[PDB]
Amino acid sequence: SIYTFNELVVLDYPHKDRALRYLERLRDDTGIKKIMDSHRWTVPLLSEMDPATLGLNHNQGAHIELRLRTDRYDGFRDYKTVKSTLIHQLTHNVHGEHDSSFWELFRQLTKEA
Ligand code: NI
């Protein structure tokens, strides 16, 4: 689809090859692809958030950041947690505040993904 992450950016820390594979896997994730296609979400930039809040959504999906690392050397967060954080950030494309409606949608997107 056009409803993907157009550009991936990782940071200059040890094992940056692994960081990039992390973002590529999230982008190629069947559940993530399905929900972005269904909801017509293009995210121009998916970037790694610096180590040392596990994600941010800037201006309704113009730029999403994900903290992949637990430290500055080789500690990475588990895919399961990062994936849920991405869905969290995507949920922010509709609901900015963590209110009743946010949790409904987040549960819905999680279900579909
Ligand atoms: Ni949030």
Residue numbers in the entry: 2 to 53, 62 to 122
Sentences from the study reporting this entry:
While most proteins were insoluble, we were able to purify the protease domain of Wss1b, one of the two SPRTN homologs in Schizosaccharomyces pombe. The overall architecture depicted a compact protease domain consisting of four tightly packed α helices and a four-stranded antiparallel β sheet. The glutamate residue E112 polarized a water molecule for the nucleophilic attack of the substrate; in agreement, its mutation to glutamine resulted in a catalytically inactive enzyme.
Covalent DNA-protein crosslinks (DPCs) are toxic DNA lesions that interfere with essential chromatin transactions, such as replication and transcription. In yeast, DPC proteolysis is catalyzed by the metalloprotease Wss1, which permits replication in the presence of DPCs and provides resistance toward DPC-inducing agents. Intriguingly, Wss1 is a DNA-dependent protease that degrades DNA-bound substrates in vitro irrespective of identity. Spartan (SPRTN, DVC1) is distantly related to yeast Wss1, displays a similar domain organization, and shares a common evolutionary origin (Stingele et al., 2015).
